[PDB]
Nucleic acid binder design. Structure first.
Ligand SMILES: */N=C(\N)N(C)CC[C@H](N)CC(=O)N[C@H]1C=C[C@H](n2ccc(N)nc2=O)O[C@@H]1C(=O)O
Ligand SMILES: [Mg+2]
Ligand SMILES: [Mg+2]
Ligand SMILES: [Mg+2]
Ligand SMILES: [Mg+2]
Ligand SMILES: [Mg+2]
Ligand SMILES: [Mg+2]
Ligand SMILES: [Mg+2]
Ligand SMILES: [Mg+2]
Ligand SMILES: [Mg+2]
Ligand SMILES: [Mg+2]
Ligand SMILES: [Mg+2]
Ligand SMILES: [Mg+2]
Ligand SMILES: [Mg+2]
Ligand SMILES: [Mg+2]
Ligand SMILES: [Mg+2]
Ligand SMILES: [Mg+2]
Ligand SMILES: [Mg+2]
Ligand SMILES: [Mg+2]
Ligand SMILES: [Mg+2]
Ligand SMILES: [Mg+2]
Ligand SMILES: [Mg+2]
Ligand SMILES: [Mg+2]
Ligand SMILES: [Mg+2]
Ligand SMILES: [Mg+2]
Ligand SMILES: [Mg+2]
Ligand SMILES: [Mg+2]
Ligand SMILES: [Mg+2]
Ligand SMILES: [Mg+2]
Ligand SMILES: [Mg+2]
Ligand SMILES: [Mg+2]
Ligand SMILES: [Mg+2]
Ligand SMILES: [Mg+2]
Ligand SMILES: [Mg+2]
Ligand SMILES: [Mg+2]
Ligand SMILES: [Mg+2]
Ligand SMILES: [Mg+2]
Ligand SMILES: [Mg+2]
Ligand SMILES: [Mg+2]
Ligand SMILES: [Mg+2]
Ligand SMILES: [Mg+2]
Ligand SMILES: [Mg+2]
Ligand SMILES: [Mg+2]
Ligand SMILES: [Mg+2]
Ligand SMILES: [Mg+2]
Ligand SMILES: [Mg+2]
Ligand SMILES: [Mg+2]
Ligand SMILES: [Mg+2]
Ligand SMILES: [Mg+2]
Ligand SMILES: [Mg+2]
Ligand SMILES: [Mg+2]
Ligand SMILES: [Mg+2]
Ligand SMILES: [Mg+2]
Ligand SMILES: [Mg+2]
Ligand SMILES: [Mg+2]
Ligand SMILES: [Mg+2]
Ligand SMILES: [Mg+2]
Ligand SMILES: [Mg+2]
Ligand SMILES: [Mg+2]
Ligand SMILES: [Mg+2]
Ligand SMILES: [Mg+2]
Ligand SMILES: [Mg+2]
Ligand SMILES: [Mg+2]
Ligand SMILES: [Mg+2]
Ligand SMILES: [Mg+2]
Ligand SMILES: [Mg+2]
Ligand SMILES: [Mg+2]
Ligand SMILES: [Mg+2]
Ligand SMILES: [Mg+2]
Ligand SMILES: [Mg+2]
Ligand SMILES: [Mg+2]
Ligand SMILES: [Mg+2]
Ligand SMILES: [Mg+2]
Ligand SMILES: [Mg+2]
Ligand SMILES: [Mg+2]
Ligand SMILES: [Mg+2]
Ligand SMILES: [Mg+2]
Ligand SMILES: [Mg+2]
Ligand SMILES: [Mg+2]
Ligand SMILES: [Mg+2]
Ligand SMILES: [Mg+2]
Ligand SMILES: [Mg+2]
Ligand SMILES: [Mg+2]
Ligand SMILES: [Mg+2]
Ligand SMILES: [Mg+2]
Ligand SMILES: [Mg+2]
Ligand SMILES: [Mg+2]
Length: 248
RNA sequence: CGCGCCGGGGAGGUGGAGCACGAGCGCACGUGUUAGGACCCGAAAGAUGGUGAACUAUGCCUGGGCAGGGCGAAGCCAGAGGAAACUCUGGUGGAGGUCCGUAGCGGUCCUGACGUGCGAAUCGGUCGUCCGACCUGGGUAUAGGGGCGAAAGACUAAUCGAACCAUCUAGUAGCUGGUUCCCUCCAAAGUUUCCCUCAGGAUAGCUGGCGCUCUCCGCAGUUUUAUCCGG
RNA sequence: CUUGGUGGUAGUAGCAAAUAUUCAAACGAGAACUUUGAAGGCCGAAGUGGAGAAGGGUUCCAUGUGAACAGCAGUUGAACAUGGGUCAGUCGGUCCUGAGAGAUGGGCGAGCGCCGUUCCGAAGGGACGGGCGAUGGCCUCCGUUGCCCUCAGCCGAUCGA
RNA sequence: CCCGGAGAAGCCGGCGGGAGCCCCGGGGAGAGUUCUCUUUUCUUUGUGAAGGGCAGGGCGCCCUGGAAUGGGUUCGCCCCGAGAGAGGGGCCCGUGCCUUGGAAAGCGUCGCGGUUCCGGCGGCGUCCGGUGAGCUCUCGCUGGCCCUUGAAAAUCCGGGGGAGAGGGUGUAAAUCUCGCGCCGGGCCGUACCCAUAUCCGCAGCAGGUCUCCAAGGUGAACAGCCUCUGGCAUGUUGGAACAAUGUAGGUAAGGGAAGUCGGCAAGCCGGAUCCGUAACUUCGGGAUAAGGAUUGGCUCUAAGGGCUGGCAGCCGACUUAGAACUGGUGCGGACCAGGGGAAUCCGACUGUUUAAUUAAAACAAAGCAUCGCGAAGGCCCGCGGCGGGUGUUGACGCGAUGUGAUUUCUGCCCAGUGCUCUGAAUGUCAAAGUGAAGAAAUUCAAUGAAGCGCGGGUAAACGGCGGGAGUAACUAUGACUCUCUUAAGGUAGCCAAAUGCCUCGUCAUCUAAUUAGUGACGCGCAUGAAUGGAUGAACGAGAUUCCCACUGUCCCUACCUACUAUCCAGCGAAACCACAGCCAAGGGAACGGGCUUGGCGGAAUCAGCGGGGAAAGAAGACCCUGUUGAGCUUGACUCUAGUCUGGCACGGUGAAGAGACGUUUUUUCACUGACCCGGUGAGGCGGGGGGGCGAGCCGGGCUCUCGCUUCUGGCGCCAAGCGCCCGGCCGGCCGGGCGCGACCCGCUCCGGGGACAGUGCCAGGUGGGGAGUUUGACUGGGGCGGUACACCUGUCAAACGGUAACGCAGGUGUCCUAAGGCGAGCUCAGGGAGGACAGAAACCUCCCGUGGAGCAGAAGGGCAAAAGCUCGCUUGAUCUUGAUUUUCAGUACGAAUACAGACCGUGAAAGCGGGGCCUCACGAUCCUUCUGACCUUUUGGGUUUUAAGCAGGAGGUGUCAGAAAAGUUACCACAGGGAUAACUGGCUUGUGGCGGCCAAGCGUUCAUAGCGACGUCGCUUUUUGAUCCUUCGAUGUCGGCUCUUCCUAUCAUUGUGAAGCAGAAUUCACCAAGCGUUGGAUUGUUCACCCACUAAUAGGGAACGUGAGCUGGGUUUAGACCGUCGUGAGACAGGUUAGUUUUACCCUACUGAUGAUGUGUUGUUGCCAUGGUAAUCCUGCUCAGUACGAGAGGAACCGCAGGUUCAGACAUUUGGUGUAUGUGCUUGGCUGAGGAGCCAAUGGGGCGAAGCUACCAUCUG
């Protein structure tokens, strides 16, 4: 009968992201002759805490090579970096933390972050707190590379694409228990309206397919098809298994 | 005229809204049955097009606001015992979804007052919390099978288990209710059969009115005499 | 049933939230309630005080009136009738942008129209100096229009406290 | 041009500085006080912005110098070779002080003129000091908090740069962010209220509505209480009374929850100091635990500080400890201000929630555990697009669920139903496409995607977790074993719990007494493991139970106060209303105000009162009917957006192979030009030279790299140089241009995909996410149950025929190749006597044999050379018109009967035969299908396929004269119904209750003292049932409380009879219902059971009396928890907890109160016809330790003394009350002090007159 929560979110308007105090987008430097052939120097002017994000950012100042004008970028901070540190970047960049070079050059077993999935997008994969990717093996023919991501999906990518060296800071966040409702409340106030998560079962049987009944119970099987209309797709999606996960 | 896989006749049964020396059309009047808003008045709902978040639901931007006391976390200072490890004793500091409690915020109980009320939800005394998921003003966003909900089917201008205004719309009713002058003459039924029929119809039955063909031989809710039947 | 009018019920129910009035004098036809004075009380700076906002829109002030209204009366009043009254470079709006709304280009749309706000756009009418041309002035020196050379990143029209 | 800054940031705490206010001590000017005191008490007692100076704070600023035997220093900190202490400096704020403004003005005072209309005019004064945990505002410093780190742009400014301009020793110049001097600053709002009377609520409505300011005292305090500044007349009126009923306030001897569903309400406790403080525990808490003592006034001592020259002297704050005295033991003196403990259940906590009946045990919440997904992606919106949100995002993330802190545990079951993985090993499987014959439409045939099947996996997916047998040396039980059924068969733990019917389970404790409560037991109707089980400190406006103290909650009521009600002056409604308003019985729609018959009846009126008027209220919400709906559900029916899958088109260019049906069907491998994606202010791409740093070869050939930047928080733009040109001036000057410097040529800006995704059109699938609709009838209420819904026999049927009930006894939805058709010939059931095996029963024979057997079936009728049984030949169970009968409307179907015309069968022949000996065994229109004629039409004519026609059978409608169809509503809605229930009322009385007759037996004996079987006759309507006449436009539905009267079927008392009666005690019966019949524990209970006294603890009605008389615990709304059932929405004469109880002023009625006619008027003292009616019972003494009786035991009558209950009065005494506001005391403030007083909603506490008044005092019956 009614339109349920899941559906009401898609139009948005209420659930859009709060973006007053966000500093900006965290994109890498754009491609150009210098990066493609040689290298370009750049200092770390300052570090900054971005809202809604575990990791911190960095005000990185470079110099524009064609016009007399200092550009600026917002890199994501690898661990161990500090202000007053010369950050090189390019093809001929030396291998040490805080230094952007294409993956192809570095050997196998190299740990990287802020990686591009396709060339030019200015850095999409692996840039949250405590993550890093592992370079497994190159492939001279076709000029492509094999890379295992933290989740485990191994992916091939063109060797040309870029990556900032080192892991992302802020690891071990999930270690501390979020003790009180308020401490959670503030977090989701920074990000989005989602926090107080009401169980569908409690609702009346208009607002949920599991609702109603005199006794609190679901009544029907909680596994469900993916060939299914919007409104029903609810519960455990395409559940291959469903139980106390013994072993791994 | 073309002759043949041509045409035409007779008798005898049977089906027909036919013949058998025509009787209709036009106009007016009455009654009766229908179709339409159709004897008058009456719905719960249905569809199309528009208007509202001045209360309230919730998110966001920019502003405002909350005495005085108790409890006394880490850190720090000092003294004492001790072989060492170290441990005991007294001060300081002022933490916290901490405690008593005011304004504010809320509104449990007395099932107290009032109950043609001061009031289409107020008053009294008694109650919970009061630095926090705290309280609040103005601006702004979301609109009806749609919005919004710490989820009660709550709320959406006193209206919500589908809002409000007009139009389609005099919407249908086997159901209640009402239905306007006199006299005279005649005068009933509630039973049969069929129906998604049992609060209803048709259909036979009962009733009236209009007449017409003959009358100054026929018929009867009856007996008698004969004659059968009856279980 | 509809509209309009009138009865009994009735000169009854009733005019009970938060302590409170009293004496003399004046105008006046008339005074429990008007005014002055005197005496006694209350609100007791989280105010029954002094100032503002939104909002109301002449209710502010004076003179006169006593029909109607102020659920008793009233010589009174926020009632009625006459007339008056709001003066800024410096106090605010006006300027700015904020969450956001909203044009243009572009696309969609039988269609009134709608999406979308930098996204598929030839998105500058500006400036200083040089040369050449053109006028106006005690043509001194300096203005006032034009071309050519040389230079220019924006960012999205516009509203929004 | 570039770089950079301000504008530009959160909350909280502490501390310091500066103002305003407050206070103190002296000075002046005027007021008030003076019975007595009082150098008294009160008011008042000033300098703006903008400039200059100086104070006064701050500084992460400089210089000198170099510290450990470490120093300085803050309440806390912190700081130091990255340069401390100690000197000298600098800067920043300067709302404070001085000054120009400015004493002329202003204010306070005294006095002169103007008669006046006057910013009138003159004296004087407007002083000097001190204080502070005080308050308020502000400036600054410094900490603490964050999975929260707390706005932008307009606008303004500084610096790095150095393109360029300027005059030749002067009246110098271009140029100045320096000091004066000139002009101008438009448009619009601007009054007032800003709220117990200017706003919104229909109004001058106790409601609601955002801010600033903010004195004295008491005190922890902005608490409460009183006063000044300022404001006001008690909030839409007054006077006279002071009764009951109310509303809000108080207090009570003795007792202390006994009242009651329940300690509901009120009351006790309350602040501080000093002692003291257990169980348990997540070791933080619990904790103001508990439990004690003190507290006043007045008069003293002592300890804590500043400033200048181990000291002195001058000043000033508030606190703390201590001591003596003194009072009628009063003292936190008013106000403000916590009742406690032991236990159990639930939920962890704080929070939120139904605006207007539910604040909870519901939700959330942290923790836990699953699932999808690496972007051409997941999830969703969207009518649409190369669209949009999450996304300024990227697996420690977004997204979808479940569970509910911690600790501890988390057993077995994948058969079912879901989900999912594998998919030629594969049954089925559409369009198009491909072969096949045919004149062609065609039809046939192969080929064949996903999906269903098939097979794996899965329970922190929905979910589930038996029974029978045998077995231990007492019985029991069953360790152990087997089997049936399913895929296992309840493991660990727990309980008559919020889950247990029977049930008040049983035992113990808790009570004198306990259906409650707590601890064990377990057979568990129906416990149980993240649909989570068990525990568990702290917390709860949560649910129950008990204990302490405490109380007018109760025995048991009384008194007082204010506001009313009451009477008066003024002003002034509405609901409601057929007529009206005294009763009993009677019959009547079965409870009448009117009727009949009886009883009766007297003006007009007041304050109260709640019995009635089936009172008002709202076209009954429960129930039923309705061919009336909505909300929701799913395995109902019929469809749909979306998503998955194949085909055709947009859609190219080449490579190799097999073959394929010079060609292809197709498998791979490329290319790119459509097309698609991403980035850029679309900035140096690919080739070819030349140049260089290195390796190898013979100035030369070849390959690759580079093209010049890695110790450091710097700067970096607007071209140097050269060559070649020339332009004006005069070999030199001034001003110009091009190209190298910075290689040349090109056709897509760079990359990645790419002929596939994709878009458009068809086709199959999936699809309660969504839409539309349906969800039979009869019915002794409906439902559940039957089918009496179409058929047939017998009876009921009352002697023609015809007749009903969910009446009776019963049957049917078939069977037959002959069990049909002719003819002939036989005669059955049963019994008797005989005969080897032979038998009660096997086979043969004679005799009897009216049918006693049989004819498929239900029963009934019918039949003997047959309708039975056996042989022989056959198929009239065929073709075809009409007529009639049965049901009946005298319409159909079916079923059958008489004839007729053909072809036949059989029998010698007359004949017989068109299905089953008779009475039941079955079906319309429309559509499809088959058969049938040299049949008709197929449209301008002709031929031939196909189709349509015509006639006769079949496929089926059993709700059987024929819609195609599942559930729920306690969230509910509408029309109506007493044609129809759940209470009452009526008639009946089975059942229940009571009572008679006969007398077989008990009672030793003796039937009948007392009882009475087998049988039998009656009454009653407080039980229960059966019925539906009344009311559904509403009669308020269970219990208790309170209160009156009434019945008698006598429990006790009075009088008397009879006993298997000696007395006592106890039994049965008559007259008799006037007077009595209790207090409590448990349960909502009526009922039940128990303790205690008694004379006795009998039974019942009146609308199951009694709701505008109460209460609202239970039933019986909405919220929620559990078990079982149901896949689910939901359900339960199965448990649990929270949940608006309306109006009286009418008529009558009763109560009390004025009054009325008549005697001519008026008093007076008096009379009684009528109504009403009252007393009750018990104890002791004596009689009497006697009569009686063996004794044990053991009375009665008259008298005497007292008591209970009830009724009627009074208030001498005791008690209560006490606002005579009578009188002492007293807390805080106010009147200068003393005295005398007042306010604090009765300020508080003592004692208390009068008067009212109590079995709580007394009297009489
Ligand atoms: N959903 C629940 N839990 N219940 C109890 C049903 C609620 C229904 N909707 C109301 C109701 O009361 N139903 C009753 C009402 C009466 C009716 N009934 C009563 C008496 C008699 N003799 N016969 C009846 O049929 O029964 C209904 C019932 O119990 O189902
Ligand atoms: Mg729907
Ligand atoms: Mg649903
Ligand atoms: Mg707290
Ligand atoms: Mg408290
Ligand atoms: Mg009440
Ligand atoms: Mg009102
Ligand atoms: Mg605002
Ligand atoms: Mg929408
Ligand atoms: Mg909320
Ligand atoms: Mg929410
Ligand atoms: Mg609910
Ligand atoms: Mg509900
Ligand atoms: Mg009409
Ligand atoms: Mg109508
Ligand atoms: Mg009716
Ligand atoms: Mg007979
Ligand atoms: Mg009265
Ligand atoms: Mg009166
Ligand atoms: Mg009032
Ligand atoms: Mg009053
Ligand atoms: Mg007061
Ligand atoms: Mg004012
Ligand atoms: Mg005025
Ligand atoms: Mg008056
Ligand atoms: Mg001016
Ligand atoms: Mg638009
Ligand atoms: Mg503007
Ligand atoms: Mg503004
Ligand atoms: Mg002065
Ligand atoms: Mg003003
Ligand atoms: Mg008001
Ligand atoms: Mg008023
Ligand atoms: Mg008054
Ligand atoms: Mg007492
Ligand atoms: Mg007492
Ligand atoms: Mg009792
Ligand atoms: Mg009680
Ligand atoms: Mg109480
Ligand atoms: Mg305790
Ligand atoms: Mg909770
Ligand atoms: Mg509510
Ligand atoms: Mg309530
Ligand atoms: Mg789960
Ligand atoms: Mg489990
Ligand atoms: Mg399975
Ligand atoms: Mg128990
Ligand atoms: Mg178990
Ligand atoms: Mg559960
Ligand atoms: Mg279970
Ligand atoms: Mg359970
Ligand atoms: Mg426990
Ligand atoms: Mg009056
Ligand atoms: Mg009547
Ligand atoms: Mg009455
Ligand atoms: Mg009544
Ligand atoms: Mg109704
Ligand atoms: Mg009705
Ligand atoms: Mg109907
Ligand atoms: Mg019907
Ligand atoms: Mg419907
Ligand atoms: Mg749908
Ligand atoms: Mg419809
Ligand atoms: Mg029926
Ligand atoms: Mg007969
Ligand atoms: Mg007969
Ligand atoms: Mg024949
Ligand atoms: Mg036969
Ligand atoms: Mg038809
Ligand atoms: Mg039919
Ligand atoms: Mg009987
Ligand atoms: Mg005998
Ligand atoms: Mg009836
Ligand atoms: Mg009635
Ligand atoms: Mg009534
Ligand atoms: Mg008698
Ligand atoms: Mg009754
Ligand atoms: Mg009532
Ligand atoms: Mg009553
Ligand atoms: Mg109940
Ligand atoms: Mg189930
Ligand atoms: Mg008498
Ligand atoms: Mg004797
Ligand atoms: Mg006395
Ligand atoms: Mg007294
Ligand atoms: Mg004195
Ligand atoms: Mg006394």
């Amino acid at each position: 009968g009614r339109v349920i929560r899941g559906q009401r979110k898609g139009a948005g308007s209420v659930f859009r992201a709060h973006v007053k105090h966000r500093k900006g987008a965290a994109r890498l430097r754009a491609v150009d002759f210098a990066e493609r052939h040689g290298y370009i120097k750049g200092i770390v002017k300052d570090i900054i805490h971005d809202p809604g994000r575990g990791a911190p950012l960095a005000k990185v100042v470079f110099r524009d090579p064609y016009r007399f004008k200092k550009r600026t970028e917002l890199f994501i901070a690898a661990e161990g970096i500090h202000t007053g540190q010369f950050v090189y970047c390019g093809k001929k960049a030396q291998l040490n933390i805080g230094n952007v070079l294409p993956v192809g050059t570095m050997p196998e077993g190299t740990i990287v972050c802020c990686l591009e999935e396709k060339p030019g997008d200015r850095g999409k994969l692996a840039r949250a707190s405590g993550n890093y990717a592992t370079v497994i093996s190159h492939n001279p023919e076709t000029k492509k590379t094999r890379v295992k991501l933290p989740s485990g999906s191994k992916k091939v990518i063109s060797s040309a694409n870029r990556a900032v060296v080192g892991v992302v800071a802020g690891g071990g966040r999930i270690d501390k228990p979020i003790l009180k409702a308020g401490r959670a409340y503030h977090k989701y106030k920074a990000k989005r309206n989602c926090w107080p998560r009401v169980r569908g079962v409690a609702m009346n049987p208009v607002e949920h397919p599991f609702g109603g009944g005199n006794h609190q119970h679901i009544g029907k099987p909680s596994t469900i098809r993916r060939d299914a209309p919007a409104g029903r797709k609810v519960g455990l999606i395409a559940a291959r298994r469903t139980g106390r996960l013994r072993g791994t």
